[PDB]
Design a binder for this molecule. Structure first.
Ligand SMILES: FC(F)O[C@H](Cl)C(F)(F)F
Ligand SMILES: FC(F)O[C@H](Cl)C(F)(F)F
Lengths: 309, 309, 309, 309, 309
């Protein structure tokens, strides 16, 4: 009884990832084929009907079922539409689309995160007793200059036809609560280049150079210098937060920034301590100088357990 | 007399809060059912009508009442529409929507505020003598990976059907000025982590280290250094406000920053005072040094009394 | 001869003021009533025509005059539309709207400016010999928690029906060049809190704290420090300008900042003068110390005459 | 033989300059009048046709010619449309429009530049053998409050009917390649206020105070203080560039900033030389102190040749 | 057998480059001519059909094939449309368009990069056995004032009609799988003005002036100062990243900045090394002093081998 419909999805561009909304944009084509009652066509050649003329065939009673992108956000932008009506009954729908799609996206390991861009397709009104997906093919371009793209695609796309039970239905009962759903999956990793060299590396240089406060020889010099070091980190928090993507949680880099604040406050506490540690009011220069390698090691050790994943 | 309408709202995503506009975005489905004139459908099976075709049926005289989201801002983005016409009279309207919705939103306890996401639904043209809401069912996903979600939902959705009296109507009088309204409410509280670690904590470290001005030995060091501390708070206000949400009032973090300006201004007023209080021109080291715990307590005491709620 | 139209405007939300564009957003309903040729309606009860069906009634010749928002900017977004057709001839038009509206807006007294949001309504094609507004009622919500709102509405809306002479018409002559116009005005003053506590006060503190340069004891100390203060004001100007609204003129806050630049430049000029005013190259400590209360009065005096209004 | 069309353009608001795109936004009405086949109208009075009805008349063979805004960028937002059909043949088209329009715009003299806003109107399909503009009238409001406006309109609009030869036409030969084009011109100058007081003045003051490096007596004091000044110019470059419009070339303020970097770098090169010029290792106090008025002249003279215009 | 289509493309504006999306905006006209069955026109003169009337011609069966912009991003904004119907069979389609177009864009040599603005045009439904492009003409305006443009167009458009094999088809087999494609290319280079004078040059001045650290005579003076130089580079990093285009990779300016960080961290290491290299604490004034020209050469060399091309 149910109509077998064959879907092919062509993907042109995956771009414009929004971290805060957890969406991404996909431009592509959708093709759908099914077979119905045969037809008289002009010539024994297939009939092509475009755009606004498709609507006319729907009014004369042509069955063209609505297929919904389950995870699109807002009505997709539809370009050219096409129906190909064959005399032997079969019907092919072809359309270009650009839409914004939603998926769960975890950005905590930024900039070393992996994301998967998902498309989910399901007929809007017809259950699997009426319309079912027979098979699904997905085509992706071979990116050859992937080194200049924001995202690197990792392996060809995954497909999976399945059936979805809607419990809470305002319809009827017997086996009429399941729908045929295509799910396309594409794995991807973030191009970590820019952030290593322009963010991680100079943040490192800055935090290390902070440790050299202990190679200053006065107390006055060490305390006062660290206030400049403090200012530098605040400025660095500002540089990063303004350019990196906004998120509701802390990233790896955000954690480094917080660490930098800590190492400088810690140093302020030791610098101020060695000035009073011992009797005589003598500067326990045993404590400093040990600090010239206590911090570059201490921070780097208890900071070497950032296995938070 | 009145037609009973049964509503189901499936909610897919609540995202995009706009602090200054006091709005939020909701992706979902709305279903509405009523019973009308019984009907002849092809086969004794229900008839499905999609998209542009609902309109044709509206014209041959099918009643599909406009149900308005009373607190939406702008015409919502409607995806696919579906009418399901039953032979025994029933009609089910099904449509997808993306909309920006409005509610009073108090963000004064940011980042520790709680908000409720509200939907208000009301027929546009017909009163409760003509159309009444029989019941409202709201379906929401249960988010468990709420830790990468900005908001924690505090229970399944609460509802309230009621009747609204419009004083100023230009229509008629006897009992025809009341409208049936569905109101959906979803409570949620904000996940404060990010703001705790990346905004509250380092502001604390900065404000704390501010106090270490009193451990400087000359007056010169004490006064000149506090100007750098002042610069540091300004640099921090810039960092926060460039990234934190815009509001017409002060939040907690806004006040901590103001406190920082104050603690540094007080310190300058004291640093300069302890230098000229006594005869002999001798540095009143009595006033200083006591400040080394006067401030870290005074602020921490006069700051543990911000019971403004 | 002319048709009487009765208008009601319900205002839901006034938000999104754009300072450079001098526009603001308004969500609301517009109701318009007039009486025409009596009609047979199904049952002697009024007939409801919604949305796309209004169009069909216009094509068969129902007179529904377009009312134009004179000061809207861009075609407004119309929500649900309704015609209610009475058997005794009268016709009521109901539509939801969201639009961007223009008005002269002076932001020179920011953040203590007063604005009035105006709506101006006028028929697009019919002159007062053809269509005139009989009366205008405006209803506004009573916001009770206005302390969480950016703008405080100050009083109920004022209204005014009047007549407009268009001189340059390519039309006809006898009394045919005047149009009936509704004008709505809603007064408002800005919520000054956030800007006082988070912008004005710390700028005041910082400007004052700058005066403490004269209490440093070296010439070297006094001059070198002024450069740090100069930087603090540049940074503060940046902070305010990045957050406050864009304007083609200076506000009070813009002016305080200029004064900050000035008081610091003045001090540099004196500090550098006191080092060479007198013979011996001796630091003229007579001039200094006297400045320690001269500026906090001097700036505080010639700055207390910014009655530029 | 060709149809004479009389055009009137009313201009309501000119706003929203986009400097990088070289566009501006224009709100107004366009009126267009011509004469055709006389007509039977209901009553011997003129017939009014609004909005959606204009299309219906076009299907019965009414000629309503497309008049295109040639320098518009993307289809304008057309508000209400109106046709006024007179019984004696004449036809008037009246429409409200908001559009983004393009013109060559030179921002090199910012914030003291003068610009002219242009509208170019031309029929889309009919050449001057078929349709020609008889005349063009342009009306603008008389602005009295220009001090609160970003732009000062300087004089009434000038108008210009002419003809355009499109050489490469795929049509025929004799004279069917010329089209009549209206060109409206409105001159305007920028309100320089905000940029004078909040950008030019303090940059000068900063640059002035930068010269006061030479009144410090040690070399150490002079060199170290030079790094703070350098930072202040970087801070200032950031402040302006965040607020000023983006351009692909430098402005006066951009130049002042580059000049500021130079005067600071220049002083650094001398300060470092005077410490090592002569034998004895003597801080050549002959060179400095003489610089206390050499630079404020040297810069201010070699700065008197930024006559790039 | 197949129909010949003649295309002419007029290009008005190429603006609004989006670096992250790798797209650009194009305003223009598209003209397409082909010949069909001769026709009765009113008079033996060509027939003009504008805008909404084209659809009526389509329903009665006029063949107007959809030509798709293959590398557009989203459905283009189409202005006025026109059909010119000649009696001797030929047909002309004329339309104005605004669209965002996609191409591979390498921004690594910023601000000295060259780009190609590409349009790829292809029929949506008909293969080359049915419809083919005979010839293609591209017309572009001649810019004389390029000194005020963001982009410099470098040479006229190059053209190339070609044929594309689509592998994955659900149709038939013999020779039905190739399509006719127009590809337009326009080369352009960026106006480097603003970036040389207001970005590159002061970076040089700033990076160079960092080298003047080695001319300080104290160790204290040298180390404490290098922390101020550090602050200056982060602040400059902020200035650049806020105004330069966002990209996923490093530019030459980005690399200088990193180099800027390096030269200062190196400097901190030598300054701190020269203080403890030798016995007794004798300050190795040979290492310093040699550095007074060691860095200005080393950096200027290891940054002069950023010939990565
Ligand atoms: F604060 C400034 F005035 O001086 C420089 Cl930046 C610092 F920070 F090192 F002290
Ligand atoms: F310098 C920057 F890194 O930070 C801001 Cl600009 C300053 F200067 F105020 F500290």
């Amino acid at each position: 009884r149910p109509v077998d419909v064959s879907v092919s999805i062509f993907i042109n561009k995956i771009y414009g990832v929004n971290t805060l909304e957890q969406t991404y944009k996909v431009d592509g084509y959708i093709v759908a084929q099914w077979t119905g009652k045969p037809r008289k066509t002009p010539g024994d050649k297939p009939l092509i009907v475009e755009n606004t003329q498709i609507e006319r065939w729907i009014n004369n009673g042509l069955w063209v079922p609505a297929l919904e992108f389950i995870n699109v956000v807002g009505s997709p932008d539809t370009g050219n539409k096409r129906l190909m009506l064959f005399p032997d009954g079969r019907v092919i729908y072809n359309a270009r689309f650009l839409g914004s799609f939603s998926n769960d996206m975890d950005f905590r390991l930024f900039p070393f995160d992996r994301q998967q861009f998902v498309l989910e397709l399901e007929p809007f009104s017809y259950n699997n007793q009426q319309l079912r997906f027979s098979d699904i093919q997905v085509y992706t371009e071979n990116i050859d200059n992937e080194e200049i793209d924001e995202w690197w695609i990792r392996g060809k796309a995954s497909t999976h036809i399945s059936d979805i039970r809607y419990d809470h239905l305002s319809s009827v009962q017997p086996n009429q609560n399941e729908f045929s759903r295509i799910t396309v999956r594409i794995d991807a990793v973030r191009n970590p280049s820019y952030y290593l060299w322009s963010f991680i590396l100079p943040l490192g240089l800055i935090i290390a150079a902070s440790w050299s406060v202990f190679w200053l020889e006065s107390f006055s010099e060490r305390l006062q210098t660290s206030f400049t070091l403090m200012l530098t980190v605040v400025a660095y928090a500002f540089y990063t937060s303004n350019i990196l993507p906004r998120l509701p949680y802390t990233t790896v880099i955000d954690q480094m920034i917080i660490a930098g604040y800590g190492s400088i406050f810690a140093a302020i506490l030791l610098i101020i301590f060695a000035h009073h540690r011992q009797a005589n009011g003598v500067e326990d220069d045993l404590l400093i100088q040990r600090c010239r390698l206590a911090f570059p090691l201490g921070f780097l050790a208890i900071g070497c357990v950032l296995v938070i994943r």
